[PDB]
Design a protein around this ligand. Structure first.
Ligand SMILES: O=P(O)(O)O[C@H]1[C@@H](OP(=O)(O)O)[C@@H](OP(=O)(O)O)[C@@H](OP(=O)(O)O)[C@@H](OP(=O)(O)O)[C@@H]1OP(=O)(O)O
Ligand SMILES: O=P(O)(O)O[C@H]1[C@H](OP(=O)(O)O)[C@@H](OP(=O)(O)O)[C@H](OP(=O)(O)O)[C@@H](OP(=O)(O)O)[C@H]1OP(=O)(O)O
Ligand SMILES: Nc1ncnc2c1ncn2[C@@H]1O[C@H](COP(=O)(O)OP(=O)(O)O)[C@@H](O)[C@H]1O
Ligand SMILES: Nc1ncnc2c1ncn2[C@@H]1O[C@H](COP(=O)(O)OP(=O)(O)O)[C@@H](O)[C@H]1O
Lengths: 885, 885
C-alpha cells in the first residue's frame, strides 16, 4: 500500500530535519515543502482507501504516480544526505564550498525539480478530493485482540486415517518398509503424520524417532548432518566428511538404537526417495519409515500401495468451522445456517474452511457479514480441482486485513520456501523496514509480537516451535499461502523481487535491476556477486541460506559499491574476513547482520553510522573487543553477540553539557563481566535483557566489582543469564542476597557456575521469576531440600548435574506447570509431593535413572485418579526418556 | 487491612538497604532478618484473607499482635535512621565514636529485641498453617474494568416532582418566596433540584442563576464571598468589607441582573436560613429561591407548605437497577426474577438500589451471585425508615472490594464533609501514602485514575465536575457513605483519627496522642497548636480548611518538633512566613505542600530531604527562585508552583561518572522562560507536562527561538502551557514550524501571546492535539480563515479576543465535539458550515454578539432537522449563557 512508503518517507524527513540541521541546511525550504505535501498525500490516500478504488478507474488512475513522484523524492533526498555527509568528511572550511557544493546542489537541483513536481500533482489531487470524501464504508471502531493460547490441538474426524496408518505399520518382521500418503495440498497429510509421530503407541513401539522435513528444495547432505546431530553433540567434525561415509555413519548410529521410525515430509520426486533411503539400514528388524506426499507417481514407485487421504465430511466441516471461529464457546443459533452453508461451500477442505474461519473472525459475528461471506464463497469455489480456487478464497480473506498486516504478510513471504522463520529476527526486520509505526504506549517489540499473534489467529501463518515460556519461537507459511503472497508482492506492489536462477538464464542487466527496491537471493550468491552488479535504488538485501559461504578476498567491495543506498543488510549466512572503507561509507544502514571467523575488533569507524538500530555478529574467538562509541549511536536498540563482548569505557562530553544516556536500548546479548560496572548500567535505564559471558567469578567476588550488586540499578530488567567460560573450579561461588536483584526478573539462566544447592533459597525468595534454567552443571551437589519461596515459578529446568537426593513438600511449588529433568543420571527419585499440585501438567525426564521413571509413572497414576475424582483438573501428560520406562 | 502496612514497610526497608548502605550498616543483619520475616507475614495474611476473617474470632485474634510488632519495628527503624543521619551531619570521622552511636546502637538494641520478637512470632505463626491449607474461597481470575462514560444521565421516574415544582414556582409574580423540598436522605432532593436548575424553562425565565451548596458545616461569609464572586470579576474590593456589606453588595449585583433563581442545598437548621436570607434583595420581582432539606421543621419555618418528595415505585426501582448494572444493554432473562425481587426488597430507595447495582457489578452476572445477594438483602433491610438499614447495605457492597480499594475508599473520608476533593491532589496523596503499589506497566498516576474510575462505577463516589476533555476534576462522598467510612476507619482499622473541636471536645493528652497514626484537624488548628502537642508516632497530618490561616511567628517550630516522624504534610490552608531549622531534619518527608506570601527562595537545605516525591508551593510573589538541588533528589516526581520558577543551573559530578538524569520526574508547573534549555530538558526524559510563565518573547523570538526548539526533545510531552506576564505588546510573535513540536502533544494553552491569526495554520498541522485553549487575547486579529489541519481536535476554546470575521468549511474540523466561545465581544458571524460536522454536539457562547446567537439557533435547527432525517447522530445540545442573546 502506498500509505506505508508515504509514512516512512515523512517520518525519515522529519527525523532528519529535527535531528541534523547541518546536512539538510542548503535545502531547508524544500524539505519543509515536501513535508507538508507528503502529509497531504497521506491524508488523500487514506480517504481513497475508505472507498473501493478497484470499483472506479479514475481512483485507480489517481493512485498511480502518487508512488513514483514519492519514490523520486526519496531518492534525491538520500543522495543529497550521503553527499553532504561526505562533504563533512571533506572538512571544507571554506565559506563558499563552490567545488562539489555544486554537486550536492546538483542533487539539490533535482530536489528542487522534485519539489516543483510535488507542488504540481498536489494541485490536481486537490481536484477530486471533495468528490472522494462524499463516499465511505466500514465506519467502525478498533477492538482489542488476544494472545493465541493453544486451542483445538485435537484433529476433527481424522482418527480413521491415524488408526489405519498405525495399523499398517509393523506387518512383516525384518523388513524396511515405507508408508506413502497422498492427497491434494491443504488436506492435512502433515497434520495426520504429526498425530501419528505423537501417538503414545508409536513412542512405545520404536525407541528412536526422528522428524525430518524434505521439500523440493531439500538438500541431501545438510539433512544427513542434522540427523547425525540427533544422536551426538557436534557436527563440525562431519562438515569435513563425504555424504556416502556420512550415510554410513547415520546407518551405524540408527542401527545401534534398536528399532527406528523416521518421518520424511512432502517428498516431490522419486529420485529424492531413492537418494535419501541409503542412510536407513535394512538390518532385518521391524523398522517403519513414514513419507507423505502430493504426487501419485512417487508414492506408487516407493511402494505399490499408497494410502490416499480423505476429505472432511459435511458434519466434520461444520464442527471445524465452529471450533475455529468460536474457539471454546459455542455458536449462537442465528448464524448456524450461514455457517453450515459455508461449510458445505468448502467441500470439506480443511485449508479452505480454516482460512474462511479466519475471514469470519476478521469480519465479525453479525448476520450481514455471514450472508455476504456465504455469497462470496458460493461465487469463488465453482470449481474443485483448480488450486486457484484456494487462491481466490485466501484473497477474499486477505482483503479485510489492515494495510499494516498486509505489508507484514507479504514481507513474511520473502523467506525461502521451507525456511523456518526465527521470530525475533522477523520482528526486528519488520521494525527496521518501517512497517510498524509508533501508536500508543507499547514498546515496538510488543506491538510486533501482537501483530504476529494476530496473523497466527486468522490461520494465515502456522506456528512450528514454541518456547519454555509458552511464547512463539519459529513460524512459517503454508505452500499455497507462500505462492499467493509471492506472486502478489512481485507482480502488483513491487514490494521486492527475487533473483533465483533457473537453468540457461542470466542475472538481469543494469537496466532491469534499476527498477528494484529489494532483493532476495537464496541460491548461488557468489555467482551473482562475481558479475559486479550495480543498482543505485536497492534499499534492502536479504540472503537466507542454509550453509555458510566464504567471501573471496577480491570480492568484498562489491556490496558497498554496488548498492550505496542500503538500509537492511542480512547476510548472516555469508562469512566475512574483513570490511572495506565503502562499508563505513554506508550512512543509511539501519539493520546490519553478518558472520565472521577471524574478527576480534569492531573498528571505530563503524560508530560513524549514525542510524544503526540493530547489530548481530558471529565470531569464533571467545572475546570480541568493541571500539566503536556505542554511546555515540543515539538510536541503537540491540547489540547481539555470541562471544563475550568488551564494551568501550564510557566518558561524558567535556565541553558539552549533554549527557550520553540512551533511552532506547533494550539488549546487550553477551557482555564481558569486566564491563558490568556502575557507569555501563547508568547509561541503559530501560534495559530489559542482559547477558554476561566470561568468568562469572569476577562478578561474584566482592573485590573487583560488586557486579551482581551493580545489577540492582536496572529497574525494568526482566531476563538475565550468567554464562561461565572458565572450565576450572578455582573456588566456590556464592550468590548475593535476594534484595540485590531487580523486582521484575522473570527468567534466569546459569551454566557452569557450579553453585551449591543450599543457595536455592535465595532464588526461592525472588517473587516474579517464572522460569529457571540451569544447564551444564550449574548447581553442584548431592543433597537439595526445598525450603519454599518459588511462588510463581512456572517451569523448572535441570540439566547435567550430579544431584542425588531431592526432598520437598507440595507447598514448595504452588504454580508449577512444567518440569524438565535432562541428563540427570545420578538422581534417585523425585519427591511424590509434586503429585499434589493441581497445575502440574507436563513433565519430562531425559537420560535419567529408571527409579525416577517408576516414581514418575506413580505420579501420573496419582494425577489420573485425581482427575477421575471429579476435580476440574487440566489434563495430564507425562514424558520419560527410556523407551522401556 | 494489615497487608497494606506490611507491604509498605517491606518496600521501604528494601529501598533503605539498597540505596543507603551506610545508614543501616550497623544493623543490616537485623534488617535482612526482618525483611524475610515481613515477606513471610505478607504471605500468611494473604492466606488468612482467603478464608473468611470477619466471621471468625480466632482469625481476628491471630491477626492482632502482628500489627503491633510491625509498628514497633517501624518506629525503631525510623528513630535509628534519623539519629544516624544526624550522625552523618556530625561528620564524626572517628572509627569508634561511642557517644550518640552507643545510644543509636542501643536503638539498634531495640531493633534487635524487636527482631527477636518478630522471630518469636515467626515461630508461632507457622503453627496454625495446617488449617489455612484446607480453606480457600473466591478462587478466580482478574478481568479488566472500563472507563466511566456517562450512564443513566436521565433520572428514572423523577420527572413528576420536577413538574409539580416547576408548575408551583412563578405563581405569585413580584415576590421573593422560598420553595422547600423534603425527603429522607438518599432519596434525591439534590438530583431533582439539579434537574430543575438545568431545565430549559428555568434558564429561559430568570436570567441570573446561582448554585450554592449548603450544609450544617456551612460558613456564611464564605457563602457570600462565593455568591458575589459568581457575578463579579474582581473580589479584591469586597474582600476587606464587612459581612453585612457583603450582603449589601450581593443585593445590588443580584438586582442588576433582573430576575434570579438561587439554589441552596441541604439546609439543616432554621437559624441557618434566618441568618442567610438578608443578602437576597426582595426587590418586588418575580424572583425565586429553591431549598431542599432532610428535616421537616426548618422546611415549615421557611414556608408553611413544603412539597414532600416521593419514593420510586417498584417499576422505577427495577428500571433503575437494570440501567445501573447493564448501562445500555438489556438484562439476560434468567436474572430478571432475581433483579426484580431485589428491587422490590429495596422499597424504592434510589440510594439502596444504586448501591446494590454496584455490588452486583462487583460480584458478577451469574445466577448464584444474584441468589446470594438477594438472600442477603432480604436479611439486611428488615426495618424501613431507620438509617442503619442503609449502612448495612453499604457494608455488603464494601465487603467485596479488593483490599487495595478498601484503603482508598476509607481514605476518601479523611476530607471534611462538604469538601469537593481535587482529583489530582487525591491521587498524589494516595501515591505518597503507599496505597498504590507498582503493578504492571501503567504509570502510578494512570493506575490511580483507574482506581478512582472504578470507585465511581460502583456508585460509592459521586462525581461533581468534569474537565473540558471529559475527565474527572473533583468528587465527593454522599453523606451516609461518609459517615459509614468515618466510623469504620476511626474505630476498627485505626487508619486515622479526627480531632473536631466541638463545644465540649478538648485536645487529648500526650498519652492518647501516643496511639494515633494520622490526624485530621479541619477546625481551629492554631488553637490545637497553641498547646504544643507531642506525639512521636504521627506519620501523616492533614488540614483541609476553606479559609487561609496565618501562622504566628512563635509557633513555626511546633509542627516539626512535635511530630519528628512525618511522612505526608498537607497544610496548603496555612500561610507560612518562613521555615525554622527543624523542617530540614524531617528526613522522612514524602509529600509536602504549603502556602506563603513572602517566600522567594527555596533554601538549599531543602535539598537535604532525600525522599521528597511531591512539592506544592502557593506563593503570591511573581517570581520564585529555587536553590535546592532538584537534580540531587532522586525520587522527585512532581514540582508545582505559581511564580515563574527559576531552576538551578545543572552541573555534572566532576570526580564521579554519575549522571544526574531523573527517570521519574513528570511535571514542572511554571518554569521561567530563561531556564528552558537543552541542559535542563536533557535531564527530564519522561516529562509529560511542562509550563512556562514569564516573558514568552524570549521563547518565541525566532532569533532566540532555540527555546521551543529545545522543547522539541521531550518525546513523551503531552501538555504544554505558554503564559505571559508582561502587559506590553512590545513586538509581534511567530510560532516556529510544526516539525519542532513533539508528536504526541494533546493539549495546548496560550495566554497573552497576542499572535496573528494566520499562524493557526501551524497548529493545524499538529496531528494528535485534542484541546486548544487560548485565553486573554492569545491570538490577536480581525480576520481568520480556516485552512484545514485540525484532524483530531475535540474542543476549541476562544476567550477575550477582538476577532470579527471567521471563515471555514465543514472539512476544516472533521471531529469537533465541543466549541467554547467566551468574551468574544467583537465577533459578528459563526460560519454555518459548522452545522455540517456530525461530531459537533455541545456548543456554548458567552458574552458574544447577538448575531452569533441567531446563527447558533439556526445551527441547532439544522442539526435537529438532520437527526430528524433518520441519521444516527449523537443528540445535539446548544447553550447560550445569557438567554436574551
Ligand atoms: O486540569 P483542569 O481540571 O482541566 O484545569 C484546567 C487547567 O489545568 P491543566 O491545564 O493543567 O490540565 C488549569 O489548572 P492548573 O493546571 O493550574 O491546576 C487552570 O487554568 P490555568 O492554566 O490558567 O491555571 C483551569 O482550572 P481553573 O478553572 O480552576 O482555573 C483549567 O480548568 P478546566 O478544567 O476547565 O480546563
Ligand atoms: O526457548 P527460549 O524461550 O527461546 O529460551 C532460550 C533463549 O531464548 P530467549 O532468551 O530469547 O528467550 C536463547 O536465546 P538466544 O541465546 O539465541 O538469544 C537460546 O539460546 P541459548 O542456549 O544460548 O540460551 C535458547 O536456545 P537453546 O538452549 O536450544 O540453544 C532458548 O531455549 P531453547 O532451548 O528452548 O531454544
Ligand atoms: N483434520 C483437520 N481438522 C482441522 N484442521 C486441519 C485438519 N487437517 C489439516 N488442518 C489444517 O490444515 C493446515 C495444515 O496443513 P496441511 O494440510 O497439513 O498441509 P499438507 O496437507 O499440504 O502437508 C492447518 O491450518 C490445519 O489447521
Ligand atoms: N431516579 C433517581 N432519583 C434519585 N437519584 C437517583 C436516581 N437514579 C439514580 N440516582 C442516583 O442516586 C444518587 C443519590 O441521590 P442524591 O440525589 O445524592 O440523594 P439526596 O438528593 O437525597 O441527597 C445520585 O448520585 C443519583 O445519581
Amino acid at each position: 500500500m502506498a500509505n506505508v512508503a508515504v509514512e516512512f518517507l515523512v517520518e525519515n524527513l522529519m527525523q532528519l530535519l529535527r535531528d541534523n540541521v547541518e546536512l539538510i541546511s542548503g535545502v531547508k525550504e524544500a524539505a519543509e515543502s515536501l513535508l507538508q505535501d507528503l502529509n497531504d498525500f497521506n491524508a488523500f490516500l487514506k480517504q481513497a482507501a475508505k472507498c473501493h478504488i478497484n470499483e472506479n478507474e479514475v481512483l485507480r488512475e489517481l493512485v498511480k504516480k502518487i508512488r513514483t513522484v514519492v519514490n523520486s523524492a526519496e531518492d534525491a533526498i538520500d543522495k543529497f544526505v550521503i553527499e553532504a555527509k561526505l562533504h563533512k568528511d571533506k572538512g571544507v572550511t571554506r565559506v563558499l564550498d563552490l567545488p562539489h557544493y555544486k554537486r550536492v546542489k546538483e542533487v539539490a537541483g533535482e530536489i528542487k525539480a522534485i519539489r516543483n513536481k510535488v507542488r504540481e500533482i498536489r494541485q490536481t489531487d486537490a481536484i477530486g478530493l471533495q468528490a472522494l470524501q462524499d463516499d465511505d464504508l466500514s465506519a467502525r471502531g478498533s477492538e482489542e485482540r488476544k494472545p493465541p493460547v493453544v486451542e483445538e490441538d485435537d484433529v476433527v474426524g481424522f482418527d480413521e486415517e491415524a488408526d489405519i496408518v498405525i495399523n499398517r505399520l509393523l506387518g512383516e518382521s525384518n523388513h524396511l518398509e515405507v508408508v506413502p500418503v497422498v492427497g491434494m495440498p491443504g488436506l492435512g497429510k502433515t497434520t495426520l503424520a504429526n498425530k501419528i509421530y505423537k501417538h503414545p503407541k508409536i513412542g512405545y513401539e520404536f525407541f528412536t524417532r526422528i522428524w525430518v522435513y524434505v521439500s523440493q528444495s531439500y538438500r541431501r547432505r545438510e539433512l544427513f548432518l542434522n540427523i547425525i546431530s540427533k544422536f551426538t553433540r557436534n557436527t563440525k567434525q562431519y562438515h569435513g566428511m563425504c555424504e556416502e561415509d556420512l550415510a554410513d555413519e547415520i546407518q551405524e548410529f540408527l542401527g545401534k538404537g534398536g528399532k527406528y521410525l523416521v518421518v520424511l515430509d512432502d517428498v516431490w520426486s522419486d529420485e529424492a526417495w531413492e537418494r535419501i533411503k541409503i542412510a536407513f539400514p535394512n538390518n532385518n528388524k521391524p523398522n517403519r519409515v513414514l513419507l507423505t506426499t502430493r504426487d501419485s507417481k512417487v508414492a506408487k514407485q516407493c511402494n505399490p500401495i499408497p494410502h490416499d487421504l480423505k476429505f472432511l465430511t459435511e458434519d466434520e466441516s461444520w464442527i471445524l468451522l465452529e471450533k475455529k471461529v468460536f474457539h471454546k464457546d459455542k455458536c449462537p443459533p442465528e448464524l448456524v445456517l450461514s455457517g453450515k452453508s459455508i461449510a458445505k461451500k468448502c467441500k470439506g477442505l480443511p485449508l479452505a474452511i480454516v482460512v474462511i474461519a479466519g475471514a469470519l473472525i476478521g469480519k465479525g459475528k453479525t448476520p450481514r457479514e455471514w450472508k455476504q461471506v456465504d455469497d462470496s464463497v458460493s461465487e469463488h469455489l465453482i470449481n474443485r480441482d483448480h488450486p486457484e480456487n484456494c487462491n481466490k478464497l485466501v484473497q477474499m480473506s486477505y482483503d479485510r486485513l489492515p494495510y499494516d498486516l498486509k505489508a507484514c504478510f507479504l514481507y513474511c513471504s520473502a523467506f525461502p520456501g521451507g525456511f523456518q522463520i526465527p521470530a525475533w529476527k522477523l520482528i526486528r526486520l519488520w521494525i527496521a523496514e518501517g512497517f510498524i509505526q509508533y501508536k500508543g504506549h507499547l514498546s515496538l517489540e510488543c506491538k510486533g509480537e501482537d501483530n504476529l499473534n494476530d496473523l497466527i489467529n486468522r490461520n494465515l501463518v502456522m506456528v512450528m516451535e514454541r518456547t519454555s515460556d509458552g511464547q512463539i519461537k519459529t513460524c512459517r507459511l503454508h505452500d499455497m499461502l507462500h505462492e499467493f503472497c509471492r506472486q502478489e508482492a512481485m507482480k502488483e506492489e513491487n514490494l521486492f523481487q527475487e533473483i533465483k536462477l533457473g537453468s540457461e538464464q542470466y542475472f538481469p542487466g543494469k537496466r532491469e535491476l534499476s527498477t528494484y527496491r529489494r532483493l532476495c537471493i537464496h541460491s548461488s550468491v557468489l555467482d551473482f556477486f562475481s558479475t559486479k552488479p550495480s543498482a543505485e535504488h536497492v534499499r534492502s538485501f536479504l540472503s537466507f541460506s542454509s550453509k555458510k559461504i566464504e567471501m573471496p578476498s577480491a570480492d568484498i567491495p562489491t556490496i558497498p559499491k554496488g548498492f550505496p543506498l542500503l538500509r537492511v543488510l542480512d547476510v548472516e549466512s555469508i562469512n566475512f574476513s574483513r570490511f572495506s572503507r565503502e562499508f563505513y561509507q554506508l550512512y543509511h544502514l539501519r539493520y546490519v547482520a553478518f558472520s565472521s571467523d577471524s574478527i576480534k575488533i569492531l573498528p571505530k569507524l563503524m560508530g560513524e553510522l549514525w542510524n544503526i538500530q540493530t547489530i548481530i555478529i558471529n565470531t569464533q574467538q571467545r572475546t570480541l573487543d568493541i571500539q566503536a562509541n556505542i554511546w555515540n549511536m543515539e538510536r541503537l536498540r540491540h547489540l547481539h553477540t555470541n562471544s563475550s563482548a568488551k564494551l568501550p569505557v564510557p566518558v561524558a562530553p567535556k565541553n558539552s553539557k549533554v549527557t550520553l544516556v540512551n533511552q532506547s536500548l533494550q539488549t546487550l546479548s553477551t557482555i564481558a563481566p569486566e564491563s558490568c560496572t556502575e557507569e555501563v548500567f547508568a547509561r541503559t535505564p530501560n534495559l530489559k535483557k542482559l547477558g554476561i559471558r566470561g568468568k562469572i567469578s569476577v562478578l561474584l567476588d566482592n573485590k573487583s566489582a560488586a557486579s551482581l550488586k551493580n545489577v540492582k540499578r536496572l529497574e525494568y530488567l526482566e531476563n538475565l543469564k550468567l554464562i561461565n567460560d572458565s572450565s576450572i573450579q578455582t573456588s566456590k561461588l556464592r550468590l548475593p542476597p535476594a534484595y540485590i536483584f531487580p523486582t521484575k526478573l522473570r527468567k534466569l539462566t546459569l551454566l557452569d557456575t557450579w553453585l551449591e544447592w543450599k543457595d536455592m533459597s535465595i532464588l526461592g525468595q525472588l517473587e516474579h521469576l517464572e522460569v529457571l534454567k540451569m544447564k551444564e552443571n550449574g548447581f553442584s551437589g548431592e543433597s537439595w531440600e526445598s525450603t519454599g519461596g518459588f511462588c510463581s515459578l512456572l517451569v523448572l529446568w535441570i540439566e547435567r548435574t550430579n544431584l542425588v537426593s531431592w526432598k520437598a513438600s507440595a507447598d514448595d511449588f504452588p504454580r508449577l506447570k512444567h518440569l524438565v529433568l535432562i541428563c540427570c543420571d545420578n538422581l534417585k527419585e523425585v519427591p511424590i509431593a509434586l503429585a499434589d499440585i493441581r497445575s502440574f501438567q507436563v513433565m519430562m525426564l531425559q537420560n535419567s535413572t529408571k527409579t525416577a521413571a517408576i516414581s514418575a509413572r506413580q505420579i501420573q497414576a496419582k494425577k489420573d485418579n485425581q482427575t477421575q475424582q471429579g476435580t476440574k483438573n487440566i489434563a495430564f501428560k507425562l514424558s520419560i526418556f527410556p523407551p522401556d520406562l
